[PDB]
Design a protein around this ligand. Structure first.
Ligand SMILES: */C1=C\C(=O)NCC/C=C/[C@H](NC(=O)[C@@H](NC(=O)N[C@H](C(=O)O)C(C)C)C(C)C)C(=O)N[C@H]1C(C)C
Ligand SMILES: */C1=C\C(=O)NCC/C=C/[C@H](NC(=O)[C@@H](NC(=O)N[C@H](C(=O)O)C(C)C)C(C)C)C(=O)N[C@H]1C(C)C
Ligand SMILES: */C1=C\C(=O)NCC/C=C/[C@H](NC(=O)[C@@H](NC(=O)N[C@H](C(=O)O)C(C)C)C(C)C)C(=O)N[C@H]1C(C)C
Ligand SMILES: */C1=C\C(=O)NCC/C=C/[C@H](NC(=O)[C@@H](NC(=O)N[C@H](C(=O)O)C(C)C)C(C)C)C(=O)N[C@H]1C(C)C
Lengths: 204, 233, 196, 222, 198, 212, 222, 196, 198
């Protein structure tokens, strides 16, 4: 039935002190059948990251679309696109399919290279922009993620702390969702460096 | 399983320092036809309890007989029928609640929303709701149907929490009620300008005001409204 | 909704209630259902607000352009443009419209355009949910060539009964008088017409 | 959602709550439902959030171009006509319910549009799920000839009626004042009556709590 | 449904596809080859709606062959699969979408490695050690989840299939009439003519 | 849900998962899908929790009455038919249960009966019931032999539920093991998949797929 | 056609300590987007140190509690005011519910008390009686928001001993009533932020060998 | 169907059209919708002919038995038996009935029992498909305690308008006068009431 | 559906019944005996709805056995079949009808002749040389219509089945896991334990 519930999966972003984090599970199943535990849902164009939950085919399609668009954007603008701008591009791109949308739940995370300010935003399937200053959740376990975040979260966490927090939010939420899990990955983003870690979680 | 035919709209109520107030217009609609106009939807049981009913009127009339029967019955072999053993609001409610739920449980509901207002023997204010599904609840203010959406927001501004009851006088309360009735007359397309209002005070008893009317309405600005956008005359 | 148009000795008068609804909620209680499509050609709208407004807005545009090219349009012509729109788009419209206009050679004329898209020229016309309750009343009280005073009364009485029985009708009664003298807007409040 | 519009002796003011929802879940606890069409023409929107934003920017964009073309200040009746004809073209499929207001060379104006394209005009209006709660307040306190401050109180009170009584409404109160003589003043978060109480505990985890399977640096440099 | 299996061993990819073709009440053929060679080192198996199945396969074939002639080169397996996904992805939003699922097995002569791609009619693409379309998965995915190693030989792999095919003949409700096996490797594509008892 | 029971040279093995789902929501990971009818009788649960859990408890009561009445333990065949016939009384009303009645009597030896709300009753050596059944069958079918050490059979059963918990989205939590001999049933622990998976992966070299 | 069922929202929670247990619930009762009451008790003391709450459809929830309380009353009559053990209560609730298997009490019920060893106990049931004892459990509208949290903070899931290379799980220590009340409050204030059917107030009933004690805290009213 | 009952100075009068239909076919043009349940307690039937007849036939039986045991029944009592039947069987009946009776102590009384099964005592009542078109007319022309002549006129006018607009109504107008003087049947033909 | 075949040769009736029992996606058993002995010389095979199937068979069995004890006699095959038809005929108009189809093969020790009765869930009874329930008919009815003789021996008959079972394994879509054969004759009922290669 619900297209956004065929493959499953979740994504979640969070802001910390001069840093942003974004994580996702690795499951890609077909209803109850688990099919792949290597389906990362996070992508990036320059220093801007994009996570996408929803129907796998569209997740793939949107990534290929934003790569196309961000590449041309760099060639013409002669600079990499910023988080805020990209958010707009994501929003208009989705609304352009207003009456036959892609079944995805996009999440943007990054640091404005010019202002150094952390940025995260979520969108409904037709572009409605939700720009939160703390966290953004998406996926079949979004309710669980909201519960986790609303409690675990606290402002200006240091990278090392934000990592614990985001990982625990993701992990415990996925464990209550039959369609999420099968491995997770977490990105900790700072002005200078970006670290990627794979979490150890239940495989059921 | 049925479907209402002749119906009454909102029933609003709230409780003040000494008692409770309840009101309801005198209309009995038949779809969009404002068919009947002398319909009393406030049923006094004894004089410490008043039952306000909305919904299907035929079912209302039925619930009315049930109530009068309850009064007659309570009197049987009861030397304290109008003393220690008279009907209490809580009894009348529990009975109605019971009946309401049994009926929905048999898939043949009494298509109504009911509010029981009154004063307990110990002076306590009683105010509780029950509908065709058997659902029940209490609050400093209670309203059925359309009144739940428009009257409550207003009435709650007077008694927002428990500690507000003792600070509210009958004047203030009755005022809120009368104003809510006006507002409902403005936006509910199934409302009437005439209505009844009843007060149940632990000191003054039961005051049942019939034939009220919405007064002091603002309509003058209507003359300055022309067209729906660009029209000038 | 209760709307009517009556032709009398000096011209024609349009009348309407001011209630717009969405279910049992009165979205607007001071609505103006008497719409101007030309100097002395007005209409009464019933049915979909969105549809009747869109239609009226277009007719107004057509008559304005018509005027620029061939001078003043007749009341008949205005009814014709409405009809064309209501008939050709009958499958996507819910508009019951009454067209009333005053002209120096014909006094006042009234054309009723019901749901189907047909046109009917008449001495007077009633429409809207409230109209059903006053068919008898109006048939027994309308007279041709009444005076402005009698007409305003006939309308005030008719619509008060419509507003009385039909829940979709209410608010104030609005009137627009179209005669050689010009255009006059009348407004009557509840307190006045309720006790008639 | 609760959005209202109130006229006062020398202008018009519009207000709204800041809750965004998806079913019974709050999507955004502080979104902005007030949209700028032109400097002095703002619009409050209810319904499908993406729609209130898109249609609002589309007409706004066209109003900007029209203004440059005609060398005149935008007029509210234009925003109103462009919006309604658009919504009508889409047979109500664009879930936008708007209250559009502002001041222009012809005075101050207050209208509302419904998803299917019909429009209203008045001195006080409300839309959204809190529509009824807000309207009860307005029906109880509006009077002709209000002062800028009176109007802001009334508008702000009506939104609260929504925030407190409507589950679909909540959080803060956003206001925008458009006075016939001055610049329009947008008051983002004019009221913030819903601050979360200090949490009972901190859930900051002791580092090393999360089991990591593998690590690596990501190359963002080209 | 039909049985479409794929398993990528050490230096090759093996595709097994049921031979039965049933229409309602009768099995019309027991030697059907549900496969198309897209290029000398790229093979694609398919299953799905009666007409779309072959129409889509042959369509993809034609294009890959045309690209080969024009460029005098053989696109990598990855590239071929990406092309196929794009095609199905378009299809899913067309007036009448191709109801076809496919497995793409190819040997990347450049990277010198075997590759297996699973793609459904929605345009969902995933690269796996082994995969399957339809119900087959429900049985084999845990068989292989158990007895599977990255460095297995082509011989070991074929034995792993034999294991899978057996389980399928034991628990699957239908008689798929056995499978036709094919191996894609550095030397191309060949069929294991002797599997009906291997 | 995944439940399996099989007969072998050393008696009967019964293994189940412990996950309860309400749609895609994971309600619990600690449900007991095995009902201990008595020292020699076990019942497995698949389908609706309430339905199985309730009626199988009721079954225990019926078995106990039989024994008081007839002064003798009820036969596996009869116990399963009590449930079978009861369930058939409600056929079409909506009961949902895929059940396994397993036991050991002197007269019957190791016996396993499959009983579902359809009214289907079957005796057999191997049965896998639940949304994860196919997965369990995959592992079980290709490693089963009548000659398995009571310790090897135990692991095969455990491993089969592990396979299912991994692939099936509705199966998971932990594994509950039982061994049935004529002396009765012997509980062989609850194994959380959270630790079991990694252990098995590392030690067996399987699940080579998953990234570790 | 007639629908015999409704949804009054609400959210409940139950946590077990070593010598106590708690059952909590918001005090908001709703119907669609309207609030019926900001304070309508949902967790009850049924005697013999048993606390229960049947959340969901209020009519059914009340009917059940009533029926169970009555069951306790007769348990006393029939067995000399003998205390009804919590496990026995649970088996009884199961029969009450399954009794209506083909026209279910549209509710999710939880009960709390002390077991025969004085230890804290929590039992939760599904609409037709499936039940199990647990250390903690959330039920209702925001159950999906609270549970994950409790899995983490009460049973220390996904938490490992720092520096143990994620090989040693954090041990299962046991919360004190004070530490429990904190989790309860944070669970609800959090739920209150994201779920429109949660708010107004939080009522907690605490069971110990000394009886049943109540605690009440307000929650945002928007 | 158009049926009404008006209480006046000397008692009460029942009126009705005589058209029964099945679709657009007039199954009977001389139908008698004024049914007797007692000497001076009659009713007006609208809705299902089968249902209203069956109901009336039963009430008549109940009042006859009531009379045998406790003497003459009141008009109120008759309305009560109808109501009991219409309410308790609301799910399988389509009967809109008007009960009118004359008694020496109360003059004439009128009880209207609409589709739901509720009862409403009134000065006069109207019902049937035709009634909608005369709500306004009747509200503006009914007066309490009119004379027999005025009442017969009020009814003849009201029903002629109902018959005029509602296709389900037509034929002749029938009346039954209930006063201390006895029972009088009146009949008015098209030619007479049409040109009123 | 399941395979239920019956063929009446010279001095006996032979019943063949598929051994598979499939539930949705999985075949749960391959040794199921879809038969019940009603009396020493009367055998009944059945197919249909999951529960009703056995419930009905055992019910009929109980009654025929009870009649036997009470009368110390064995009802003729004709009589047994007439009883069964009456039972199904009642069922068809009951609240919840038995969805069961049956073949009744018996040897009339009196007339000294074998008899085959076909009866569907509607209570339709017909006596035939050979019969079948479900789809099997669509294949076998013309096989037998071809190679069938009244005076055939039990041996010839079993060969005729082998012919039928082969065609069914060739064209039927499902894997019914072979059949269990049984012969009813003057000496009673016995099973042909060796047909999985006869
Ligand atoms: C006259 C009343 C009528 O003639 N007919 C009743 C129908 C009302 C139409 C109009 N009001 C609206 O269209 C309102 N929107 C609306 O009703 N939307 C539907 C809904 O049920 O919500 C949708 C289309 C299913 C709103 C736009 C005001 C009305 O009040 N008509 C009046 C008069 C012509 C204004
Ligand atoms: C005002 C509240 C309302 O007026 N009405 C309640 C419906 C809410 C609308 C909006 N939130 C959304 O639109 C959410 N997206 C969404 O609903 N998408 C549809 C879907 O079914 O998934 C698509 C368009 C078919 C999400 C963007 C939050 C909302 O909160 N409305 C507010 C106010 C205008 C923000
Ligand atoms: C085994 C999984 C399955 O075999 N099948 C999936 C369906 C799951 C059923 C069971 N969980 C429940 O039954 C839940 N309760 C429930 O669904 N109640 C119904 C309702 O609509 O509320 C009632 C019966 C109408 C709840 C108890 C979790 C489940 O998880 N099945 C497992 C195993 C047998 C526990
Ligand atoms: C008064 C007119 C009404 O009040 N209502 C209109 C419905 C008419 C009822 C009655 N006539 C009949 O019942 C005729 N039968 C009939 O309509 N059958 C239906 C059909 O459409 O054919 C069936 C039930 C679907 C016939 C029995 C005369 C009628 O004329 N009502 C009058 C007045 C009360 C006689």
């Amino acid at each position: 039935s619900d297209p956004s519930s065929i493959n499953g999966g979740i994504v979640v972003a969070m802001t910390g002190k001069d840093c942003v984090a974004i994580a996702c599970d690795l499951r890609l199943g077909s209803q109850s059948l688990g099919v792949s535990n290597k389906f990362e849902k996070i992508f990036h164009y320059g220093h801007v990251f994009l996570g996408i939950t929803g129907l796998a085919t569209d997740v793939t399609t949107l990534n290929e679309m934003f790569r196309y668009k961000t590449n041309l954007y760099k060639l013409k603008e002669e600079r990499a696109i910023e988080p805020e701008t990209f958010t707009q591009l994501v929003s208009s791109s989705l609304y352009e399919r207003r009456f036959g949308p892609y079944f995805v739940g996009p999440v943007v995370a990054g640091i404005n290279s010019k202002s150094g300010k952390p940025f995260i935003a979520g969108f409904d399937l037709i572009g409605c922009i939700d720009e939160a200053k703390d966290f953004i959740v998406s996926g079949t376990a979004s309710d669980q993620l909201f519960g986790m975040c609303e409690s675990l979260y606290e402002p200006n966490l240091e990278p090392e702390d934000l990592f614990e927090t985001i990982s625990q939010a993701l992990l415990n939420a996925a464990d209550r969702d039959a369609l999420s899990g099968w491995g997770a990955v977490v990105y900790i983003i700072k002005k200078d460096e970006v670290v990627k870690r794979y979490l150890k979680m239940r495989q059921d | 399983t049925q479907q209402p035919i002749v119906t009454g709209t909102s029933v609003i109520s709230m409780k003040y320092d000494n008692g409770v107030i309840i009101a309801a217009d005198n209309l009995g609609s038949y779809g969009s036809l404002l068919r009947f106009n002398g319909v009393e939807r406030l049923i006094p049981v004894g004089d410490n309890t008043v039952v306000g009913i909305s919904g299907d009127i035929s079912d209302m009339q039925h619930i009315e007989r049930l109530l009068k029967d309850l009064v007659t019955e309570n009197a049987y072999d009861n030397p304290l029928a109008d003393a220690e053993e008279a009907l209490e609001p809580s009894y009348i409610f529990e009975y109605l609640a019971t009946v309401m739920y049994q009926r929905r449980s048999k898939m043949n509901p009494l298509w109504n929303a009911i509010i029981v207002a009154g004063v307990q023997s110990n002076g306590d204010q009683f105010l509780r709701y029950v509908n065709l599904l058997g659902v029940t609840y209490s609050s400093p203010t209670l309203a059925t149907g359309f009144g739940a959406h428009m009257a409550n927001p207003l009435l709650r501004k007077v008694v927002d929490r428990e500690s507000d009851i003792p600070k509210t006088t009958v004047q203030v309360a009755e005022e809120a009620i009368v104003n809510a009735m006006r507002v409902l007359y403005y936006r509910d397309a199934r409302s009437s300008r005439n209505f009844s209002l009843a007060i149940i005070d632990k000191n003054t008893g039961l005051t049942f005001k019939k034939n009220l009317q919405v007064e002091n309405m603002k309509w003058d600005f209507a003359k300055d409204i022309k067209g729906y956008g660009t029209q000038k005359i | 909704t209760s709307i009517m148009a009556v032709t009398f000795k000096d011209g024609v008068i349009l009348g309407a209630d001011s209630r717009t609804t969405t279910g049992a909620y009165i979205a607007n209680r001071v609505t103006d259902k008497l719409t101007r499509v030309h100097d002395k050609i007005w209409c009464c709208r019933s049915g979909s607000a969105a549809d009747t407004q869109a239609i009226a807005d277009i007719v107004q545009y057509h008559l304005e352009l018509y005027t620029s090219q061939y001078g003043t349009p007749s009341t008949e012509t205005a009814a014709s443009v409405f009809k064309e729109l209501c008939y050709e788009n009958k499958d996507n419209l819910t508009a019951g419209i009454i067209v009333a206009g005053y002209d120096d050679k014909n006094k006042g004329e009234v054309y009723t355009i019901p749901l189907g898209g047909s046109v009917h020229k008449l001495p007077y016309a009633i429409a809207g949910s409230g109209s059903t309750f006053i068919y008898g009343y109006c048939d027994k009280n309308f007279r041709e060539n009444m005076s402005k005073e009698e007409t305003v009364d006939f309308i005030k009485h008719s619509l008060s009964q419509a507003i009385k029985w039909d829940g979709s009708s209410g608010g104030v009664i609005r009137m627009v008088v179209l005669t050689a003298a010009g255009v006059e807007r009348l407004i009557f409040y509840p307190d006045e017409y309720e006790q008639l | 959602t609760t959005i209202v519009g109130v006229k006062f002796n020398n202008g018009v003011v519009i207000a709204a709550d800041t809750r965004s929802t998806q079913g019974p879940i709050v999507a955004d606890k502080n979104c902005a439902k007030l949209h700028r069409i032109s400097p002095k023409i703002w619009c409050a929107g209810a319904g499908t959030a993406a729609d209130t934003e898109a249609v609002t920017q589309l007409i706004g964009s066209n109003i900007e171009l029209h203004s440059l073309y005609t060398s005149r200040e935008p007029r509210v009746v234009s925003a109103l006509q462009m919006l309604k004809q658009h919504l009508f073209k889409y047979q109500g499929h664009i879930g936008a319910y708007l209250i559009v207001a502002g001041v222009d060379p012809t005075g101050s104006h207050l209208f509302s549009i419904h998803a299917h394209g019909s429009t209203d005009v008045g001195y006080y209006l409300s839309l959204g799920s809190g529509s009824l709660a807000a309207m009860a307040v307005l029906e109880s306190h509006w009077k002709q000839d209000l002062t800028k401050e009176e109007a802001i109180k009334l508008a702000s009170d009506a939104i609260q009626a929504g925030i407190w009584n409507d589950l679909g409404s909540g959080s803060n109160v956003d206001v925008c004042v458009m006075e016939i003589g001055k610049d329009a003043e947008y008051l983002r978060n004019y009221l913030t009556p819903n601050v979360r109480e200090e949490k009972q505990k901190s859930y900051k985890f002791p580092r090393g709590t999360t089991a990591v399977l593998k690590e690596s640096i990501v190359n963002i440099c080209d | 449904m039909d049985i479409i299996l794929g398993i990528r061993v050490q230096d090759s990819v093996i595709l097994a596809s049921s031979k039965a073709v049933t229409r309602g009440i009768s099995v019309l053929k027991d030697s059907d080859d549900k496969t198309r060679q897209l290029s000398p080192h790229t093979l694609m198996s398919f299953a799905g709606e009666a007409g779309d199945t072959v129409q889509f396969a042959e369509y993809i074939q034609a294009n890959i062959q045309l690209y080969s002639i024009r460029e005098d080169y053989e696109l990598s397996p990855q590239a071929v699969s990406s092309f196929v996904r794009q095609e199905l992805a378009k299809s899913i939003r067309s007036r009448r979408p191709y109801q076809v699922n496919v497995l793409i097995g190819g040997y990347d002569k450049k990277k010198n490695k075997p590759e297996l791609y699973q793609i459904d009619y929605l345009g969902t693409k995933v690269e796996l050690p082994y995969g399957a379309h339809g119900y087959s998965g429900f049985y084999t995915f845990s068989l292989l989840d158990h007895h599977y190693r990255p460095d297995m030989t082509t011989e070991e792999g074929l034995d792993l299939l034999k294991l899978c095919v057996q389980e399928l003949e034991k628990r699957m409700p239908m008689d798929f009439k056995g499978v036709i096996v094919k191996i894609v490797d550095k030397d191309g594509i060949r069929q294991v003519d002797d599997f009906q008892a291997q | 849900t995944t439940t399996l029971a099989f007969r072998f040279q050393g008696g009967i093995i019964v293994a189940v998962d412990s996950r309860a789902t309400a749609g895609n929501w994971v309600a619990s990971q600690t449900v007991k899908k095995v009902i201990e009818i008595n020292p020699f009788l076990l019942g497995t649960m698949a389908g609706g929790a309430a339905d199985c859990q309730f009626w199988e408890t009721w079954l225990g009561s019926q078995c106990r009455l039989h024994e008081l009445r007839e002064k003798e333990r009820i036969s596996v065949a009869a116990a399963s038919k009590i449930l079978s016939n009861l369930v058939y009384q409600y056929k079409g009303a909506g009961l949902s249960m895929g059940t396994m009645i397993c036991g050991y009597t002197r007269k019957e030896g190791p016996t396993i009966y499959y009983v579902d709300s359809d009214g289907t009753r079957l005796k057999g050596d191997i049965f896998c019931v639940g949304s994860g059944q196919t997965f369990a069958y995959g592992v079980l079918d290709s490693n089963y032999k009548w000659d398995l050490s009571v310790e090897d059979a135990l692991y095969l059963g455990k491993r089969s539920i592990l396979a299912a918990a991994h692939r099936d989205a509705y199966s998971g939590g932990s594994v509950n093991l039982y061994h049935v001999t004529e002396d009765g049933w012997i509980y062989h622990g609850n194994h959380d998949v959270g630790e079991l998976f990694w252990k098995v992966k590392e030690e067996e070299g399987s699940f080579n797929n998953v990234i570790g | 056609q007639f629908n015999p069922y409704g949804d009054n929202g609400g959210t409940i929670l139950g946590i077990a300590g070593e010598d106590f247990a708690v059952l909590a619930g918001d005090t908001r009762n709703i119907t669609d987007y309207s609030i019926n009451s900001r304070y309508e008790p949902k967790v009850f003391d049924c005697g013999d140190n048993i606390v229960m709450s049947a959340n969901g459809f209020a009519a059914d929830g009340d009917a059940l509690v009533k029926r169970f309380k009555n069951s306790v009353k007769w348990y006393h009559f029939d067995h000399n005011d003998k205390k009804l053990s919590i496990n026995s209560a649970a088996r009884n609730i199961q029969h009450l519910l399954y009794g209506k298997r083909f026209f279910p009490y549209y509710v999710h019920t939880i009960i709390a008390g002390l077991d025969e060893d004085g230890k804290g106990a929590v039992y939760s049931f599904d609409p037709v009686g499936s039940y199990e004892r647990e250390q903690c459990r959330a039920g209702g509208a925001a159950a999906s928001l609270i549970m994950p949290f409790l899995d983490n903070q009460v049973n220390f899931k996904n938490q490992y001993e720092p520096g143990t290379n994620g090989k040693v799980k954090k041990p299962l220590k046991y919360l004190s009533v004070e530490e429990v009340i904190k989790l309860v409050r944070d669970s609800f204030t959090s739920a209150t932020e994201r779920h429109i059917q949660v708010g107004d107030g939080l009522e907690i009933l605490i069971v110990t060998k000394d009886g049943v004690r109540k605690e009440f805290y307000e929650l945002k009213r928007d």
